[model samples]
Structure formats: C-alpha cells, structure tokens
Target: MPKSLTDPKLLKNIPMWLKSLRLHKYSDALSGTPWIELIYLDDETLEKKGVLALGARRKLLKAFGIVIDYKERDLIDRSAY
Candidate 1:
C-alpha cells in the first residue's frame, strides 16, 4: 500500500471494482429488493493497525454502532490510518 491515501491507485480502483462485482451479482441475491453498499477500510490499513479479530468480526462492527445512511453508503471510498 502507498504511504498516503492519495498515492495509491489500487485504493482508488477498489470501490469501482467492488461496485462492478456487486452489480454483477445483485439480481441473483436480491431479485427485487432495494440494497445499499458499504466498503470499509482496505486490508492494508486494517493490517497496519493490528486489527485482527479472533472470531466473529461482527463484534467489532457492533462496537462502532454505525448507521449507514444514504450519503455514507455512497461514500464507499476512504482510507484512515
């Protein structure tokens, strides 16, 4: 990973790649239901932070108590380190 978020093209492309994958599989998973997307930090950031979980990673997410609103969902691209 690049030292800075602005320096990594891979980081920039991740959201678009993920969106393409989700769109490709959307109909198979959700025939008619509405859906939202949220991509958290990249593996590099998480690994750098020593954020390995023992099991049940949902526990970590639950700790944050985040509510993914429309704008937040749309803002899928970010890096925090």
Candidate 2:
C-alpha cells in the first residue's frame, strides 16, 4: 500500500520541489536580514553571528533547514572599508 500524503487541498509536493531545487548550492547568493542583536554578544561572535544567517537552502529545501535569518537583507556585509 502507498502512504498517502497529507493533502487536504493545496497539497504542495515537497518531493517534486526537491528535485528542481539546487539544495546543496551556495546559499551566500540568498538574501538575508540583520543580526543586530548579535552585536551585543562578546565572544566567538563572528561564528555565532554567521550561523545567524547561514545554514543553506538545502535545509530549507529539505523541509527542515532554517536559522534566525530571514529572506530580507544581510547585515554581515559591514563595508568595503
């Protein structure tokens, strides 16, 4: 017997989505918001702050990937100076 999907209606297909998704690709190309709150911390702040905006799209595509980051803009770019 086949395991039926939990689709009441707009039953979106994650499996199909995964097929077309470049899951393991570089997520740096993706957008991000700010992690300003991290500025208050004084430690491996760099790492902690980085993961604050990165994990990868694959995780999201895996239907389980995500962090404190948002699909807005990156606050880590700082400046060229």
Candidate 3:
C-alpha cells in the first residue's frame, strides 16, 4: 500500500531546486533548514553543511543571488595614493 504524502507543502521546493543545479546530494543534510534562512547561506555555511564541490557551491550561490567576497563593486581609488 502506498503511504499518503504527509509532508506539509513547503514554501519552497529546495530539494528539487537544488536538483536543478546537480546539488541534490546535500538535500538530506539540509532537510530541516528554514527556507528563509537557507536563502541567506554563504559559502562557508554551505560548506559546513557538507556541500563541498566548488561547482555546486557556485551554482547554488548564483541561483540564490548570493555574492561571496564580491569585489567588482568595491573598486579602490588608486588616484588617492
């Protein structure tokens, strides 16, 4: 007999979303993570959660619109030297 789906509907489908980026492997490790907070995961946080592949991290960060150590907008004024 098939068990009925008892899982509550999620605000976001994080597992399937990560699957799109080939990062579904971390789904179990991040199961209880809150959606609101998950969106804010930085590189270090993602790494701590066992998301080790650089490509996977970058893809997740990019999709989440997170920019780690972003330097392009922080141009130094060399003329001030």
Candidate 4:
C-alpha cells in the first residue's frame, strides 16, 4: 500500500502456502500457530466482524504469486518464523 512502482518479478506467481493460508499480525509465538499468536487472531477477528468477503482475502493472496513473506521479522522470542 505504500509507495512503489511496477510489480516485481518475484510476484509473478503467488506462493502455494498463501492462497489458502491465513495472514497474521505480530509474530514468533509458538501458540495459535501465528508463524501473531493472539495478535494474529485479532486481525482475523476484525475481518470476521467486518463486511469483507472471501474475495477480499483472495485478493490479498493474489499478490503473493511474486513475493515471499516470513514471520521472522515479527518474532522476538525466536523459533522458526
């Protein structure tokens, strides 16, 4: 959503894990499988309560085709992200 021009080749094809996978906030917690623990759930909960639909989530995932994301940036305790 920030400033950037032109799509990167890395996004040409979304990753297999993202299409069906859930996105989360925060990170590094062993619990809740956040990969945000509860924080992850917070975002999810908001979406569930909001009027968004499956397509919204799908759109978010579509961008993954060219990029790879990881949990390491959010994890402080350190465990595989």
Candidate 5:
C-alpha cells in the first residue's frame, strides 16, 4: 500500500488539505511572480514510489529544480519522520 494511503504515522503527520491549499497558493503566486515555476508529482509517479520516501522526493525536486529549500518543502520532508 502507498505510504500516504496506508501509513498512519505519515497520515497523522501530513495534512492533505493543507498541501492542496499550498499548491493552490503556489499556482496563484506563479500568475503574478516572475521566474517561479511549480511542478507537482503525478499520481502514477507517487504510486511508483511511496509518497513518504525521501529518495522519491529528492528525485522529483532534482528533476524540476523545485524550491526544496523553501520552508514548506522542508516541513513536508522533515515531518514525515
């Protein structure tokens, strides 16, 4: 089973609605901000690798040069523990 779907600890630690809101915020911000791009993982990609897997997150971030340094990413990645 997928980590986000099955792991209680992960579920308790991460907030799906909040993540959705943050993504929405990112989308809205992109409309007005220059030189910012937001890339999100597809369900297929998330399914291929467990959602809580650091390697998967790193790969995705690397592929898109995501703002992993941002506080939001840090919270998501670190809170998975």
Candidate 6:
C-alpha cells in the first residue's frame, strides 16, 4: 500500500494538516511518508525511517493514535493504496 506522500487526503490526516495545527518543526522530519507507512511510525520505526528527534516521533505516534480508524478503514484504501 504505497500511496504518495503528497496526496491531499493523506496530508489532511497527518503532519501537513498538523501544520494547520501548527507543528511545522516536527513536520520537517515527515518527508516522503505515505499514510499507510506513517501510521506505522513509532520510536524504533522512526529510528529506522529517518526521524531523529524524540519529540517528533512522540507527536507522530500521538497523531496516529488520534486517527484510530487508520487500522480498519485503512483496509478500504488497500484497494486504492
């Protein structure tokens, strides 16, 4: 499920929208991640994926938790992803 990182719908649900939420500093580390992949981000995962700041990863994890539907409804996009 490798959707583009730039898709508007995807951005709305992640850090890009959080830029509207005003977390642009951490938004810097959010480069190139698709919604499916972003949903999987964690401390270790962020370590592997490239985000270096603890605060960034923490917020990303918190963001993912906010959108709990990503796990199940995400299946709808599996065909689309």
lDDT of each: 0.29, 0.26, 0.52, 0.29, 0.33, 0.54
| Candidate 2: segments with Cα more than 4 A from true spot | 1-11, 24-55, 58-81
Candidate 5: tens digits of C-alpha lDDT, residues 2-33: 33322324233234311422322222222232
Candidate no. 5 TM-score = 0.22
Q: After superposition, how far is residue 79 of candidate 6 from its true place, in Å?
A: 11
Decoy 2 TM-score against native: 0.18
Residue 59 in model 4: lDDT: 40
**Candidate 1 regions with alpha-carbon error over 4 angstroms:** 1-39, 42-47, 55-57, 63-65, 70-81
In TM-score terms, candidate 1 sits at: 0.21
1-81 in candidate 6: lDDT tens per residue? 223333456554455544533455554555566555676667878756655667766766665555535444553344425
What's the ranking of the predictions by lDDT, best on top? 6, 3, 5, 1, 4, 2
lDDT by residue (tens digit), candidate 4, 1-81:
311111222122123222233433211121223213222333244245341555434444342221223332432223322
Q: What's the lDDT for residue 47 in model 6?
A: 55
TM-score of each: 0.21, 0.18, 0.58, 0.23, 0.22, 0.54
Prediction RMSDs, each to the true structure? 12.5, 15.7, 14.4, 12.2, 14.4, 6.0
| Candidate 3 lDDT, 1-81, residue by residue in tens | 001111123214557656555666777777667444665787878878777777776776765552212212322232211
Tell me the number of clashing residue pairs for each predicted model. Answer: 0, 2, 0, 6, 0, 0
Which of the numbered candidates is closest to the native, going by highest lDDT? 6
Which ranges in model 3 have alpha carbons more than 4 Å from their true place? 1-11, 66-81
Candidate 5 regions with alpha-carbon error over 4 angstroms: 1-50, 66-81
**lDDT of prediction 4:** 0.29
* Candidate 2 lDDT by residue in tens digits, 1-81: 001111211013333322233432322322132223222233333334332323333234223221122212332222300
Instruction: Write candidate 1's Cα lDDT for 1-81 as tens digits.
Output: 212222223223433222332322223322222222223433333333333432212422331123232225544244421
Which is the leading candidate under TM-score? 3
